Amino acid sequence: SARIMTFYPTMEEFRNFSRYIAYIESQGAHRAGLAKVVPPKEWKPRASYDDIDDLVIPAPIQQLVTGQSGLFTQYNIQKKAMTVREFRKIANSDKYCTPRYSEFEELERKYWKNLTFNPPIYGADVNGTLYEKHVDEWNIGRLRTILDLVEKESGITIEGVNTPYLYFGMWKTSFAWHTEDMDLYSINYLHFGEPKSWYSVPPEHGKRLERLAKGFFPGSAQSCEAFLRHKMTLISPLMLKKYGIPFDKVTQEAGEFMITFPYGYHAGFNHGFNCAESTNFATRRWIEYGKQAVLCSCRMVKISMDVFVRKFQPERYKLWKAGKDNTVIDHTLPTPEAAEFL
């Protein structure tokens, strides 16, 4: 019942990325807003990670968290550029390393208890890829989805959106509740290290989480229509439970992929020193989400939907451009590409 699903594709199933997203949607994976994909054992994107210690993290961020009673605001403080070595030194030090724990529920408890203490540093938004040049399956650098149209027609690039981002984590580093820019899909691969825990709200209950955040942060909601887009709001699983917001949790381990679906609210934290690579992608189903996404009004990323409507919805272009497209999204419907599996 809209629970996070895990998939284990064969090497043959793994070779076609877009076809596999259509397959996981025909299985109802999009309903949770988050799905896990475990690659075939024979697949590796890079032979070793012992040769990246001198890699530059240009803008590392000290994550300052303020709040109480399961409601917090994350302030990012830019620090001087450092290497993966200097970063790992701080990450694996006694001051910033992972505390001792028996089960995930205990580490999750420590996270929500200590989130405001000892601000960690996040090696976030590093422009790059750790994939070897001749890796042809699930290459984050080149997924080959319909999102490619923006770069194809204009050549414009949006860092981390249609290019890959690297994220060097440490214990207690986190990402606030949010949906992707333009309500796009996202792919996350944990290259190595300690796990990454994720929280997810099904897209069909997403307007509920927004309403709740508006009630808890009225000043923030008055200044911006979509303040959650600022990626500063942390809401504990206990608060979500209290206010009856349906959600699920999952832990991503090194060598696994996490996929977020359009309008899928997600949050989470790093268990310790690790590295993840991510980008956004799209399917034909995303078009409607992109046309209807509520963007930051104070305040940011904005993609012109005209090329997508022109190519995939030509009949509705005149109606849509005149403000007469009164289409209602059904979050339970899979992507049209999934037709072959249904």
Ligand X SMILES: Nc1nc(-c2nccc3c(=O)[nH]cnc23)cs1
Work out which of 181, 210, 256, 277 binds ligand X, going by CB under 6 A. 181
286 binds, among ligand X, Zn ion, none (CB under 5 to 8 A by kind): none
Element (H, E) at 216: helix 206-216
Residue 298: contacted member of Zn ion, ligand X, none (CB under 5 to 8 Å, by partner type): Zn ion
Q: Mark residues 141-180: x for contact with ligand X by CB under 6 A, - for none.
A: --------------------------x-------x----x
Residue number of the CB closest to ligand X reads: 175
Residue by residue, DSSP assigns 168-209 as: EE-TT-EEEEE--GGG-EEEEEEEEES-EEEEEE-GGGHHHH
Per DSSP, 72 falls in state E
Q: Choose, by CB under 5 A, the member of 221, 224, 239, 329 that binds Zn ion.
A: 224
CA neighbor of 42 nearest in space, from 255, 192, 279, 257: 255
Q: Which of residues 183-202 bind ligand X (CB under 6 A)?
A: 188, 196
Using CB under 5 A as the binding rule, whether residue 296 contacts Zn ion is answered as yes
Query: What residues are annotated to the active site?
Result: 160, 167, 178, 180, 266, 278
The residue to which tokens 């995930």 are assigned: 104
Tokens of 89: 């030194």
Contact 268, 260 (CB under 8 A): no
- Burial of 312 (C-beta count, 10 Å sphere; 0-12/13-18/19+): middle
Closest CB 276 distance from Zn ion, rounded Å: 11
Question: Could you say whether residue 333 binds Zn ion (CB under 5 A)?
Answer: no
Residue numbers at the binding site for ligand X (CB under 6 A): 124, 167, 175, 180-181, 188, 196, 231, 266, 276
Residues annotated in a binding site? 122, 178, 180, 188, 196, 224, 230-231, 266, 296, 298
